[PDB]
Amino acid sequence: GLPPGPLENSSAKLVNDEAHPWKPLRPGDIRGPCPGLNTLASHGYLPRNGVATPAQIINAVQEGFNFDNQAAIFATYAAHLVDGNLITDLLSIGRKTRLTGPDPPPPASVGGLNEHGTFEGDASMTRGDAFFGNNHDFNETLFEQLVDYSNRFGGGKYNLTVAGELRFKRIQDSIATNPNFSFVDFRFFTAYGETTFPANLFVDGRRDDGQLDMDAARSFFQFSRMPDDFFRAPSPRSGTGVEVVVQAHPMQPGRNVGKINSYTVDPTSSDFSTPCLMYEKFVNITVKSLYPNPTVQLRKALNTNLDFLFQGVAAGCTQVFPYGR
Ligand code: HEM
Ligand SMILES: *[C@@H]1O[C@H](CO)[C@@H](O)[C@H](O)[C@H]1NC(C)=O
Ligand SMILES: *[C@@H]1O[C@H](CO)[C@@H](O)[C@H](O)[C@H]1NC(C)=O
Ligand SMILES: *[C@@H]1O[C@H](CO)[C@@H](O)[C@H](O)[C@H]1NC(C)=O
Ligand SMILES: *[C@@H]1O[C@H](CO)[C@@H](O)[C@H](O)[C@H]1NC(C)=O
Ligand SMILES: *[C@@H]1O[C@H](CO)[C@@H](O)[C@H](O)[C@H]1NC(C)=O
Ligand SMILES: c1ccc2ccccc2c1
Ligand SMILES: [Cl-]
Ligand SMILES: [Mg+2]
Numbered sequence: 001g002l003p004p005g006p007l008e009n010s011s012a013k014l015v016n017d018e019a020h021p022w023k024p025l026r027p028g029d030i031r032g033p034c035p036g037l038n039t040l041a042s043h044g045y046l047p048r049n050g051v052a053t054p055a056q057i058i059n060a061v062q063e064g065f066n067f068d069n070q071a072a073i074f075a076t077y078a079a080h081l082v083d084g085n086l087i088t089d090l091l092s093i094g095r096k097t098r099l100t101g102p103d104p105p106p107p108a109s110v111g112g113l114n115e116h117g118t119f120e121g122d123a124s125m126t127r128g129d130a131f132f133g134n135n136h137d138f139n140e141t142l143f144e145q146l147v148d149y150s151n152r153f154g155g156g157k158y159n160l161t162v163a164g165e166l167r168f169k170r171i172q173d174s175i176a177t178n179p180n181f182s183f184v185d186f187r188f189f190t191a192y193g194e195t196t197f198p199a200n201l202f203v204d205g206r207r208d209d210g211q212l213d214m215d216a217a218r219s220f221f222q223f224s225r226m227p228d229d230f231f232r233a234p235s236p237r238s239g240t241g242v243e244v245v246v247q248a249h250p251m252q253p254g255r256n257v258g259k260i261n262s263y264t265v266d267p268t269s270s271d272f273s274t275p276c277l278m279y280e281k282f283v284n285i286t287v288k289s290l291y292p293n294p295t296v297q298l299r300k301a302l303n304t305n306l307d308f309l310f311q312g313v314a315a316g317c318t319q320v321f322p323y324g325r
Contacts, residue, residue, distance in 0.1 A: 001055040003308050006069040012205030012234035016226040032094025032113040033136045035220045040064045042224035050093040054080045065201045071238035074312025081287050082118035086301035108290040121187035123170040126221045131178045138222045157211040160241045163195035164248025175263045181256040184269040188253040193239035205231040276317035288322045
Protein backbone atom coordinates (compact mmCIF):
# COMPACT_ATOMS: atom_id res chain seq x y z
CA GLY A 1 0.00 0.00 0.00
CA LEU A 2 0.98 3.69 -0.27
CA PRO A 3 2.80 5.46 2.57
CA PRO A 4 0.21 7.26 4.73
CA GLY A 5 0.15 11.06 4.67
CA PRO A 6 0.50 13.30 7.74
CA LEU A 7 -2.19 13.59 10.36
CA GLU A 8 -5.19 15.69 9.42
CA ASN A 9 -5.47 16.78 13.07
CA SER A 10 -2.13 16.72 14.93
CA SER A 11 -3.33 18.20 18.27
CA ALA A 12 -2.49 16.62 21.64
CA LYS A 13 -5.13 14.11 22.64
CA LEU A 14 -5.62 11.16 24.96
CA VAL A 15 -4.04 8.14 23.27
CA ASN A 16 -4.35 5.76 26.24
CA ASP A 17 -8.09 5.56 25.54
CA GLU A 18 -10.88 2.95 25.58
CA ALA A 19 -10.15 1.70 22.06
CA HIS A 20 -6.40 1.31 22.85
CA PRO A 21 -5.98 -0.31 26.27
CA TRP A 22 -2.68 -1.80 27.39
CA LYS A 23 -2.71 -5.59 27.50
CA PRO A 24 0.00 -8.04 28.57
CA LEU A 25 1.75 -10.29 26.07
CA ARG A 26 0.11 -13.53 24.93
CA PRO A 27 2.23 -16.52 23.88
CA GLY A 28 3.74 -15.73 20.49
CA ASP A 29 3.49 -11.92 20.80
CA ILE A 30 6.69 -10.24 19.62
CA ARG A 31 8.37 -7.21 21.15
CA GLY A 32 11.80 -5.92 20.20
CA PRO A 33 14.40 -3.18 20.69
CA CYS A 34 12.08 -0.19 20.02
CA PRO A 35 10.02 1.00 23.01
CA GLY A 36 7.89 3.17 20.69
CA LEU A 37 6.72 0.35 18.42
CA ASN A 38 6.49 -2.01 21.41
CA THR A 39 4.11 0.40 23.17
CA LEU A 40 1.99 0.83 20.04
CA ALA A 41 1.65 -2.96 19.71
CA SER A 42 0.80 -3.32 23.45
CA HIS A 43 -1.96 -0.70 23.11
CA GLY A 44 -3.36 -2.16 19.85
CA TYR A 45 -2.27 0.74 17.62
CA LEU A 46 -0.36 -2.02 15.87
CA PRO A 47 -1.35 -5.69 15.77
CA ARG A 48 -0.72 -6.99 19.27
CA ASN A 49 1.45 -9.88 18.01
CA GLY A 50 4.12 -7.39 16.81
CA VAL A 51 3.88 -8.18 13.08
CA ALA A 52 2.71 -5.30 10.89
CA THR A 53 2.78 -3.72 7.45
CA PRO A 54 4.76 -0.53 6.78
CA ALA A 55 1.49 1.39 6.35
CA GLN A 56 0.27 0.13 9.75
CA ILE A 57 3.55 1.22 11.37
CA ILE A 58 3.43 4.71 9.84
CA ASN A 59 -0.18 5.23 10.87
CA ALA A 60 0.51 3.94 14.40
CA VAL A 61 3.56 6.14 15.12
CA GLN A 62 1.65 9.21 13.90
CA GLU A 63 -1.65 8.47 15.62
CA GLY A 64 -0.24 7.15 18.93
CA PHE A 65 2.80 9.44 19.41
CA ASN A 66 2.62 12.23 16.77
CA PHE A 67 5.85 11.04 15.09
CA ASP A 68 6.35 13.24 12.03
CA ASN A 69 5.49 11.86 8.60
CA GLN A 70 8.88 12.23 6.91
CA ALA A 71 10.69 10.54 9.80
CA ALA A 72 8.01 7.83 9.98
CA ILE A 73 8.40 7.06 6.28
CA PHE A 74 12.21 6.95 6.31
CA ALA A 75 12.52 4.77 9.42
CA THR A 76 9.72 2.39 8.46
CA TYR A 77 10.82 1.69 4.90
CA ALA A 78 14.48 1.48 5.93
CA ALA A 79 13.58 -1.14 8.54
CA HIS A 80 11.26 -3.00 6.15
CA LEU A 81 13.86 -3.10 3.35
CA VAL A 82 16.52 -4.71 5.57
CA ASP A 83 14.42 -6.65 8.12
CA GLY A 84 10.95 -7.20 6.57
CA ASN A 85 9.43 -9.46 3.93
CA LEU A 86 9.05 -7.44 0.76
CA ILE A 87 6.65 -9.92 -0.93
CA THR A 88 4.18 -10.34 1.96
CA ASP A 89 4.64 -6.68 3.09
CA LEU A 90 5.16 -7.77 6.71
CA LEU A 91 7.75 -6.76 9.31
CA SER A 92 8.37 -8.15 12.80
CA ILE A 93 9.06 -5.49 15.44
CA GLY A 94 11.32 -8.02 17.20
CA ARG A 95 12.55 -11.56 16.55
CA LYS A 96 12.53 -13.44 13.27
CA THR A 97 9.21 -15.18 12.77
CA ARG A 98 7.51 -17.48 10.30
CA LEU A 99 4.57 -15.06 10.53
CA THR A 100 6.23 -12.75 7.98
CA GLY A 101 5.81 -15.52 5.35
CA PRO A 102 8.01 -17.48 2.95
CA ASP A 103 11.54 -16.10 3.04
CA PRO A 104 13.56 -14.73 0.11
CA PRO A 105 16.89 -16.38 -0.78
CA PRO A 106 19.99 -15.49 1.25
CA PRO A 107 21.81 -13.29 1.97
CA ALA A 108 18.54 -11.51 2.90
CA SER A 109 17.71 -12.50 6.47
CA VAL A 110 14.19 -11.07 7.10
CA GLY A 111 15.21 -11.15 10.75
CA GLY A 112 12.84 -8.55 12.20
CA LEU A 113 14.02 -5.50 14.12
CA ASN A 114 16.11 -7.81 16.37
CA GLU A 115 18.53 -8.38 13.45
CA HIS A 116 21.86 -6.91 14.51
CA GLY A 117 23.70 -4.53 12.22
CA THR A 118 20.90 -3.73 9.76
CA PHE A 119 18.80 -1.20 11.69
CA GLU A 120 19.49 -2.28 15.30
CA GLY A 121 22.95 -1.52 16.65
CA ASP A 122 25.32 -0.86 19.50
CA ALA A 123 25.31 1.64 22.38
CA SER A 124 21.56 1.54 22.89
CA MET A 125 20.42 3.19 26.12
CA THR A 126 18.31 0.41 27.71
CA ARG A 127 19.30 -2.62 25.58
CA GLY A 128 22.69 -4.34 25.55
CA ASP A 129 24.98 -4.68 22.56
CA ALA A 130 24.43 -7.86 20.52
CA PHE A 131 27.95 -9.07 21.45
CA PHE A 132 26.83 -9.37 25.08
CA GLY A 133 24.01 -11.82 24.20
CA ASN A 134 20.78 -9.82 23.93
CA ASN A 135 20.13 -6.74 21.81
CA HIS A 136 16.38 -6.48 22.40
CA ASP A 137 15.13 -7.10 25.95
CA PHE A 138 14.83 -4.30 28.48
CA ASN A 139 17.92 -4.26 30.71
CA GLU A 140 17.40 -3.17 34.32
CA THR A 141 21.06 -2.26 35.00
CA LEU A 142 21.15 -0.05 31.89
CA PHE A 143 17.83 1.54 32.83
CA GLU A 144 19.13 2.27 36.36
CA GLN A 145 22.10 4.01 34.71
CA LEU A 146 19.60 6.12 32.73
CA VAL A 147 17.93 6.96 36.08
CA ASP A 148 21.30 7.90 37.58
CA TYR A 149 22.16 10.16 34.62
CA SER A 150 18.69 11.73 34.94
CA ASN A 151 19.37 12.39 38.64
CA ARG A 152 22.80 13.86 37.88
CA PHE A 153 22.06 15.97 34.78
CA GLY A 154 18.26 16.36 34.62
CA GLY A 155 17.14 17.03 38.20
CA GLY A 156 15.66 13.54 38.25
CA LYS A 157 14.09 13.80 34.78
CA TYR A 158 15.34 12.67 31.38
CA ASN A 159 15.94 15.64 29.09
CA LEU A 160 18.30 16.55 26.21
CA THR A 161 21.16 17.37 28.61
CA VAL A 162 20.82 13.87 30.10
CA ALA A 163 20.65 12.43 26.57
CA GLY A 164 23.94 14.16 25.67
CA GLU A 165 25.74 12.65 28.65
CA LEU A 166 24.19 9.18 28.48
CA ARG A 167 24.74 8.85 24.72
CA PHE A 168 28.47 9.45 25.24
CA LYS A 169 28.68 7.14 28.27
CA ARG A 170 27.15 4.24 26.31
CA ILE A 171 29.58 4.81 23.42
CA GLN A 172 32.58 4.87 25.79
CA ASP A 173 31.38 1.72 27.63
CA SER A 174 30.99 -0.16 24.31
CA ILE A 175 34.49 0.99 23.25
CA ALA A 176 35.88 -0.31 26.55
CA THR A 177 34.10 -3.68 26.55
CA ASN A 178 32.76 -4.69 23.11
CA PRO A 179 35.64 -5.70 20.77
CA ASN A 180 33.17 -5.76 17.86
CA PHE A 181 31.65 -2.31 18.60
CA SER A 182 30.40 -0.71 15.37
CA PHE A 183 29.31 2.93 15.20
CA VAL A 184 29.15 3.92 11.53
CA ASP A 185 26.73 4.97 8.82
CA PHE A 186 23.06 4.26 9.61
CA ARG A 187 23.66 3.39 13.27
CA PHE A 188 25.79 6.50 13.83
CA PHE A 189 22.74 8.56 12.79
CA THR A 190 19.98 6.63 14.58
CA ALA A 191 21.94 6.31 17.84
CA TYR A 192 21.83 10.10 18.26
CA GLY A 193 18.26 10.74 17.17
CA GLU A 194 16.81 7.96 19.34
CA THR A 195 18.14 9.62 22.49
CA THR A 196 15.83 12.62 21.84
CA PHE A 197 12.73 10.49 21.41
CA PRO A 198 11.95 9.98 25.12
CA ALA A 199 12.13 13.75 25.70
CA ASN A 200 10.10 14.60 22.56
CA LEU A 201 7.53 11.78 22.43
CA PHE A 202 7.19 10.06 25.86
CA VAL A 203 6.46 13.39 27.61
CA ASP A 204 2.71 13.99 28.05
CA GLY A 205 1.69 16.40 25.30
CA ARG A 206 -0.19 18.77 27.63
CA ARG A 207 3.22 19.57 29.11
CA ASP A 208 5.58 19.00 26.15
CA ASP A 209 8.37 20.38 28.35
CA GLY A 210 11.09 17.89 27.39
CA GLN A 211 11.35 16.56 30.97
CA LEU A 212 10.47 12.87 31.18
CA ASP A 213 9.81 11.48 34.67
CA MET A 214 11.23 8.08 35.62
CA ASP A 215 7.85 6.43 36.29
CA ALA A 216 6.78 7.22 32.72
CA ALA A 217 10.25 6.28 31.40
CA ARG A 218 10.07 2.83 33.03
CA SER A 219 6.47 2.31 31.85
CA PHE A 220 7.47 2.82 28.20
CA PHE A 221 10.98 1.29 28.21
CA GLN A 222 10.21 -1.82 30.30
CA PHE A 223 6.47 -2.46 30.03
CA SER A 224 5.54 -0.99 26.64
CA ARG A 225 2.80 0.87 28.52
CA MET A 226 1.51 4.42 28.29
CA PRO A 227 0.89 6.13 31.59
CA ASP A 228 -2.72 6.32 32.71
CA ASP A 229 -4.33 9.29 30.90
CA PHE A 230 -1.35 9.72 28.52
CA PHE A 231 -1.75 12.50 25.95
CA ARG A 232 0.46 12.33 22.85
CA ALA A 233 2.69 15.22 21.81
CA PRO A 234 0.87 18.37 20.60
CA SER A 235 2.49 18.54 17.15
CA PRO A 236 4.41 16.24 14.77
CA ARG A 237 8.06 15.67 15.69
CA SER A 238 10.85 13.12 15.96
CA GLY A 239 14.46 14.17 16.54
CA THR A 240 14.30 17.84 17.37
CA GLY A 241 17.14 18.82 19.74
CA VAL A 242 19.55 16.16 18.47
CA GLU A 243 22.07 19.00 17.98
CA VAL A 244 22.21 19.36 21.81
CA VAL A 245 23.08 15.67 22.16
CA VAL A 246 25.83 15.83 19.50
CA GLN A 247 27.24 19.11 20.83
CA ALA A 248 27.68 17.65 24.33
CA HIS A 249 30.33 15.17 23.07
CA PRO A 250 30.94 15.28 19.31
CA MET A 251 32.06 11.92 17.92
CA GLN A 252 33.39 10.59 14.63
CA PRO A 253 31.99 7.38 13.11
CA GLY A 254 34.17 4.33 13.65
CA ARG A 255 34.49 0.88 15.15
CA ASN A 256 36.59 -1.24 17.44
CA VAL A 257 38.85 -3.44 15.30
CA GLY A 258 38.49 -6.82 17.02
CA LYS A 259 39.82 -5.64 20.39
CA ILE A 260 38.53 -3.42 23.18
CA ASN A 261 39.88 0.15 23.29
CA SER A 262 40.76 0.19 19.57
CA TYR A 263 38.18 2.68 18.24
CA THR A 264 39.25 3.46 14.70
CA VAL A 265 37.65 6.22 12.67
CA ASP A 266 36.10 5.15 9.36
CA PRO A 267 36.61 7.79 6.64
CA THR A 268 34.29 5.84 4.31
CA SER A 269 31.36 6.34 6.73
CA SER A 270 28.82 9.07 6.35
CA ASP A 271 28.57 11.52 9.25
CA PHE A 272 26.31 14.50 10.02
CA SER A 273 28.13 16.57 7.38
CA THR A 274 27.03 14.06 4.68
CA PRO A 275 23.40 13.01 5.24
CA CYS A 276 22.76 12.13 1.55
CA LEU A 277 25.74 9.75 1.67
CA MET A 278 24.03 7.89 4.53
CA TYR A 279 21.00 7.35 2.28
CA GLU A 280 23.12 6.38 -0.77
CA LYS A 281 25.17 3.83 1.15
CA PHE A 282 22.09 2.40 2.80
CA VAL A 283 20.60 1.68 -0.64
CA ASN A 284 23.73 0.89 -2.69
CA ILE A 285 25.50 -1.23 -0.07
CA THR A 286 23.18 -2.36 2.70
CA VAL A 287 19.99 -3.12 0.75
CA LYS A 288 21.80 -4.24 -2.42
CA SER A 289 24.01 -6.68 -0.51
CA LEU A 290 20.90 -8.38 0.95
CA TYR A 291 19.29 -8.57 -2.52
CA PRO A 292 22.17 -8.65 -5.06
CA ASN A 293 20.31 -10.33 -7.99
CA PRO A 294 16.61 -10.40 -7.19
CA THR A 295 14.03 -12.29 -9.19
CA VAL A 296 11.17 -10.51 -10.93
CA GLN A 297 8.59 -10.11 -8.14
CA LEU A 298 11.33 -9.21 -5.57
CA ARG A 299 12.91 -6.64 -7.85
CA LYS A 300 9.52 -4.96 -8.29
CA ALA A 301 8.86 -4.97 -4.52
CA LEU A 302 12.37 -3.59 -3.84
CA ASN A 303 11.85 -0.72 -6.29
CA THR A 304 8.44 0.15 -4.84
CA ASN A 305 9.77 0.21 -1.27
CA LEU A 306 12.91 2.12 -2.34
CA ASP A 307 10.66 4.77 -3.95
CA PHE A 308 8.74 5.02 -0.66
CA LEU A 309 12.02 5.27 1.29
CA PHE A 310 13.09 8.20 -0.86
CA GLN A 311 9.90 10.08 0.09
CA GLY A 312 11.31 10.14 3.64
CA VAL A 313 14.69 11.58 2.62
CA ALA A 314 15.26 15.26 3.44
CA ALA A 315 15.03 17.50 0.38
CA GLY A 316 18.30 18.08 -1.45
CA CYS A 317 19.35 14.48 -2.03
CA THR A 318 19.31 12.66 -5.36
CA GLN A 319 17.52 9.31 -5.62
CA VAL A 320 19.69 6.30 -6.41
CA PHE A 321 18.53 3.29 -8.39
CA PRO A 322 20.32 0.00 -7.63
CA TYR A 323 17.98 -2.10 -9.84
CA GLY A 324 17.39 0.52 -12.58
CA ARG A 325 14.29 2.67 -13.16
C1 HEM B 1 8.73 4.93 12.75
C2 HEM B 1 9.10 3.66 12.86
C3 HEM B 1 10.08 3.17 13.87
C4 HEM B 1 10.99 2.18 13.64
C5 HEM B 1 11.05 1.32 12.39
C6 HEM B 1 11.80 2.07 14.80
C7 HEM B 1 12.86 1.15 14.97
C8 HEM B 1 13.74 1.15 16.04
C9 HEM B 1 14.84 0.24 16.20
C10 HEM B 1 15.20 -0.90 15.28
C11 HEM B 1 15.49 0.57 17.34
C12 HEM B 1 16.71 -0.11 17.93
C13 HEM B 1 17.96 0.72 17.65
C14 HEM B 1 18.93 0.36 18.72
O1 HEM B 1 18.86 0.99 19.82
O2 HEM B 1 19.76 -0.56 18.58
C15 HEM B 1 14.80 1.67 17.91
C16 HEM B 1 15.14 2.32 19.08
C17 HEM B 1 14.33 3.28 19.69
N1 HEM B 1 13.11 3.69 19.30
FE1 HEM B 1 12.28 3.31 17.58
N2 HEM B 1 11.41 2.96 15.71
C18 HEM B 1 10.40 3.72 15.21
C19 HEM B 1 9.65 4.72 15.84
C20 HEM B 1 9.83 5.16 17.16
C21 HEM B 1 8.93 6.01 17.85
C22 HEM B 1 7.65 6.61 17.30
C23 HEM B 1 9.48 6.18 19.12
C24 HEM B 1 8.93 6.93 20.26
C25 HEM B 1 7.67 7.31 20.39
C26 HEM B 1 10.69 5.39 19.20
C27 HEM B 1 11.56 5.31 20.25
C28 HEM B 1 12.74 4.59 20.24
C29 HEM B 1 13.70 4.67 21.35
C30 HEM B 1 13.64 5.52 22.61
C31 HEM B 1 14.71 3.84 21.01
C32 HEM B 1 15.98 3.59 21.80
C33 HEM B 1 15.92 2.46 22.80
C34 HEM B 1 17.20 2.43 23.60
O3 HEM B 1 18.29 2.86 23.13
O4 HEM B 1 17.18 1.98 24.76
N3 HEM B 1 10.84 4.75 18.00
N4 HEM B 1 13.71 1.98 17.13
C1 LIG C 1 -8.61 18.21 16.56
O1 LIG C 1 -8.64 17.27 17.64
C2 LIG C 1 -8.72 17.93 18.90
C3 LIG C 1 -8.42 16.94 20.04
O2 LIG C 1 -8.96 15.64 19.76
C4 LIG C 1 -10.09 18.63 18.92
O3 LIG C 1 -10.38 19.21 20.20
C5 LIG C 1 -10.09 19.70 17.83
O4 LIG C 1 -11.29 20.49 17.84
C6 LIG C 1 -9.89 19.02 16.47
N1 LIG C 1 -9.82 19.94 15.33
C7 LIG C 1 -10.71 19.93 14.32
C8 LIG C 1 -10.48 20.92 13.22
O5 LIG C 1 -11.67 19.17 14.28
C1 LIG D 1 30.19 -7.80 14.67
O1 LIG D 1 30.36 -6.71 13.75
C2 LIG D 1 29.91 -6.92 12.40
C3 LIG D 1 29.90 -5.56 11.70
O2 LIG D 1 31.18 -4.94 11.84
C4 LIG D 1 28.51 -7.54 12.32
O3 LIG D 1 28.24 -8.04 11.00
C5 LIG D 1 28.31 -8.67 13.33
O4 LIG D 1 26.94 -9.10 13.32
C6 LIG D 1 28.71 -8.18 14.73
N1 LIG D 1 28.30 -9.21 15.71
C7 LIG D 1 27.99 -8.95 17.00
C8 LIG D 1 27.52 -10.09 17.90
O5 LIG D 1 28.10 -7.83 17.46
C1 LIG E 1 22.30 -5.90 31.39
O1 LIG E 1 23.38 -4.96 31.25
C2 LIG E 1 24.46 -5.19 32.15
C3 LIG E 1 25.42 -4.00 32.07
O2 LIG E 1 25.98 -3.89 30.75
C4 LIG E 1 25.06 -6.54 31.81
O3 LIG E 1 26.18 -6.80 32.68
C5 LIG E 1 24.00 -7.63 31.97
O4 LIG E 1 24.53 -8.92 31.64
C6 LIG E 1 22.79 -7.31 31.09
N1 LIG E 1 21.75 -8.33 31.20
C7 LIG E 1 21.02 -8.60 32.27
C8 LIG E 1 20.05 -9.73 32.10
O5 LIG E 1 21.12 -8.01 33.33
C1 LIG F 1 17.77 19.21 32.10
O1 LIG F 1 17.42 19.41 33.46
C2 LIG F 1 18.41 20.15 34.20
C3 LIG F 1 17.92 20.26 35.64
O2 LIG F 1 16.58 20.76 35.69
C4 LIG F 1 18.61 21.54 33.59
O3 LIG F 1 19.73 22.19 34.22
C5 LIG F 1 18.88 21.46 32.10
O4 LIG F 1 18.87 22.79 31.55
C6 LIG F 1 17.83 20.60 31.43
N1 LIG F 1 18.05 20.52 29.99
C7 LIG F 1 17.09 20.68 29.08
C8 LIG F 1 17.54 20.58 27.66
O5 LIG F 1 15.91 20.88 29.35
C1 LIG G 1 25.08 4.63 -5.63
O1 LIG G 1 24.88 4.05 -6.93
C2 LIG G 1 24.59 5.03 -7.94
C3 LIG G 1 24.38 4.31 -9.26
O2 LIG G 1 23.13 3.61 -9.21
C4 LIG G 1 25.75 6.02 -8.05
O3 LIG G 1 25.43 7.10 -8.94
C5 LIG G 1 26.04 6.64 -6.70
O4 LIG G 1 27.17 7.52 -6.80
C6 LIG G 1 26.29 5.56 -5.68
N1 LIG G 1 26.59 6.16 -4.38
C7 LIG G 1 27.44 5.60 -3.51
C8 LIG G 1 27.63 6.36 -2.23
O5 LIG G 1 28.02 4.54 -3.70
C1 LIG H 1 15.44 4.94 15.13
C2 LIG H 1 14.08 4.76 14.97
C3 LIG H 1 13.31 5.67 14.27
C4 LIG H 1 13.92 6.78 13.71
C5 LIG H 1 13.21 7.73 12.99
C6 LIG H 1 13.87 8.83 12.46
C7 LIG H 1 15.24 9.01 12.61
C8 LIG H 1 16.00 8.08 13.32
C9 LIG H 1 15.38 6.97 13.88
C10 LIG H 1 16.11 6.04 14.60
CL1 LIG I 1 4.08 15.11 9.96
MG1 LIG J 1 20.83 -1.74 19.99
